[PDB]
Amino acid sequence: YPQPKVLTPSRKDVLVVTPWLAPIVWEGTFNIDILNEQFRLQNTTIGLTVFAIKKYVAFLKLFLETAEKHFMVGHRVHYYVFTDQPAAVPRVTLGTGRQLSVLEVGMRRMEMISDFSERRFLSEVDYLVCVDVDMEFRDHVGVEILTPLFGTLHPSFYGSSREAFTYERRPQSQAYIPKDEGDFYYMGAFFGGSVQEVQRLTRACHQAMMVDQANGIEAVWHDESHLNKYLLRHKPTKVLSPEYLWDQQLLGWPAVLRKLRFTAVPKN
């Protein structure tokens, strides 16, 4: 493969590493051939959780069809589809080494991911990735994201200063973040990590949300506000650029995005 170029920046228009030395994953920062080898040598298995409750079962067909074309191709994958309507889950044909399980349901997502992430039947699974369903894959989402703990830059806020971030601002909430604190604003629609780090994150967020509930407060952006509090205090080991959570109808195709990899499906 090509030799890296010590004296040539991978990017001149964006930040590619956080101040705590976690890579920020953009196109042009990684050679997927090297990463795919490293992760295949460990026979890595990726679990993907996705919730499709009530009308949102309609989003599953395109979500799964496009995941098969773009998500972790060549690696072992297990989809876990959480739904109140198991018969509505479309029968999509999967590539080899890929499986799908339907978990009937029934704070919902963090509580349910926490309970599920503690089950022994995940012994085989190495990483969990937790995403919204009202989305489609348009380009590669692969093992470059995998790491002990990651969050994703929210596509509306990546250029914002921290006072503009919509963190929970009331001190009476467990999700509270002061106006002079905060590294980034992370989207609740795409986070993940090793099974252990996802257990810890979802347990912390669910236990925080139960405290707030006992106290009669609901954080401003619900589990996303608790996710931001958690990732402020437990800094992620990679941060995904907005390539990985984009809304093209809202935000177009800016010059800093070389690829739109996982994008919102327009809805009401």
Ligand X SMILES: O=c1ccn([C@@H]2O[C@H](COP(=O)(O)OP(=O)(O)O)[C@@H](O)[C@H]2O)c(=O)[nH]1
Ligand Y SMILES: CCCCCCO[C@@H]1O[C@H](CO)[C@H](O)[C@H](O)[C@H]1O[C@@H]1O[C@@H](C)[C@@H](O)[C@@H](O)[C@@H]1O
Binding residues (CB under 6 A) for ligand Y: these are: 154-156, 166, 187, 221, 224, 247, 250, 264
Q: What is the CA radius of gyration of the chain?
A: 18
Binding flag, residue 191, ligand X (CB under 6 A): no
Among 19, 106, 171, 216, binds ligand U5P (CB under 6 A): 19
Nearer to Mn ion among residue 217 and residue 220 (C-beta): 220
Which tokens sit at 46? 């990726």
DSSP 14: S
The residues carrying an active-site annotation are 224
Binding flag, residue 27, ligand X (CB under 6 A): no
Peptide bond just before 74 cis, omega within 30 deg? no
Nearer to Mn ion among residue 126 and residue 134 (C-beta): 134
DSSP 3: P
Q: Chain-centre distance of CA 242, in angstroms?
A: 11
What are the residues whose beta carbons fall under 8 Å from the beta carbon of 23, sequence distance 6 or more? 16, 17, 29, 238, 239
Binding flag, residue 38, its own copies (CB under 8 A): yes
Which of ligand Y, ligand U5P, Mn ion, none sits in contact with 144, Cβ below 5 to 8 A by type? none
- β-strands 45-52, 76-83 pairing: parallel
Which of ligand Y, ligand U5P, Mn ion, none sits in contact with 224, Cβ below 5 to 8 A by type? ligand Y
* Total of residues contacting its own copies (CB under 8 A): 42
Are 167 and 177 a contacting pair, CB within 8 Å?
Answer: yes
SS3 66: helix
The answer to whether 127 is annotated as binding is no
Which of its own copies, Mn ion, ligand Y, none sits in contact with 38, Cβ below 5 to 8 A by type? its own copies
Interacting positions 50-69 with ligand X (CB under 6 A): 51-56
Interacting positions 29-58 with ligand U5P (CB under 6 A): 29-31
Binding flag, residue 238, its own copies (CB under 8 A): yes
Residue 129 identity: V
Are 161 and 250 a contacting pair, CB within 8 Å?
Answer: no
Would you put residue 210 in left (φ > 0), alpha (ψ -120 to 50) or beta?
A: alpha
DSSP 246: B
- Chain contacts with its own copies (rule: CB under 8 A): 1, 3-25, 29-31, 34-35, 38, 144, 153, 158-159, 161-162, 182-184, 235, 238, 256
Residues that bind ligand X (CB under 6 A): 51-56, 132-134, 189
Task: Specify binding-site residues.
Answer: 51-53, 56, 132-134, 154, 166, 224, 247
